[PDB]
Amino acid sequence: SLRTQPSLYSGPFPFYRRPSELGCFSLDAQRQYHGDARALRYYSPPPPDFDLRDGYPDRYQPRDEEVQERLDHLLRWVLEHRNQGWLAGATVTWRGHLTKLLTTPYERQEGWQLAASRFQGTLYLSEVETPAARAQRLARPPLLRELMYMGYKFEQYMCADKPGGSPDPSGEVNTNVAYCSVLRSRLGNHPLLFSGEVDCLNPQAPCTQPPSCYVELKTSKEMHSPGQWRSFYRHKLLKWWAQSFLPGVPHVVAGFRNPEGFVCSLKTFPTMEMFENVRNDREGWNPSVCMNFCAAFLSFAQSTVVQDDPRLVHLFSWEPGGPVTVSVHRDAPYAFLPSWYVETMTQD
Ligand SMILES: [Mg+2]
Question: Which residues bind adenosine 3',5'-bisphosphate?
């Protein structure tokens, strides 16, 4: 087991390598994979009065969340690019999985599970939906469903499909569509290969080379008091920082929503400056604690997963308050590396 309290992980900010984009892939409106950037949209801010409720629900095509894709689309990319043993000493995951590790020392509400499998040296990490999270997903109240749509809608007001184009929110929001950047990094002694969904690219960004040219878009409720801002800095900026820090996305652009579902204000939060909001806060978060924990977890997983075997899973389970605990599983349902990937890699 691995303890999770922040005090264990205070100390110097560890080494995190400047991320390089190795490539990308797109999922289209039918969730079919394409090894190019067709799904990538372009940051096109107002020059805001955005109705995030517009099109809900008649122009809404939500992804079927029952389909658990796990690492499948990343593994296709890896398979088609394993000529770009560095991989053997790496850990392969989704950006979002690493985000959840980053936020663990401070997370008090949502637990997680991560399946680990070692296969020809490489450590693969793939999130498992917990029974409790599966319960909440199926029991999603109308208001949660509207809120989620609103987050996706915001993007349609802020992005165009061509550089410098005008946003066109008259169409449908279809959440099968995704653009994913594939990045290489390293946290201390742990080489990383991961994909992350990317909201848009800013043509007028100072550095036009990805991932620096990318922008993350967010919505949050409007705030009218120091206390509301302080809770926002403490809870939501931590999540936003941990999401955008990893892939090297330098800006998060937030639209603040009315209780009536309109965005009438925008604010840019540079990733590099987010921690400043809580640096002198007795109940704030700390990016060095986030990264030190993550590095500790990677070391823990790497020493725990001894056997090289794609049918074997070490399930890392964590609930708020407690340590990360481990259980050992084989085959269904936890085994996540598909035959089509294992055989092709074995073929080499
Ligand atoms: Mg976003």
Answer: 148, 199, 243
Structural domains in the chain (count) = 1
Q: Residue 194: give the domain boundaries.
A: 1-348
Is 86 annotated to bind a ligand? Reply is no
Please state how this structure was obtained: X-ray
Distances (CA, A) of 158 to 37, 124, 215, 236, 260: 18, 35, 11, 21, 19
CA 209 / ligand 1 centre spacing (Å): 20
What is the stated resolution of the deposited model, in angstroms? Answer: 2.0
Neighbours of 168 (CB within 10 A): 12
Cα 298 to middle of ligand 1, angstroms: 26
Q: How many A from CA of 341 to the centre of ligand 1?
A: 30
- Distance (Å, whole) CA 176 – CA 62: 7
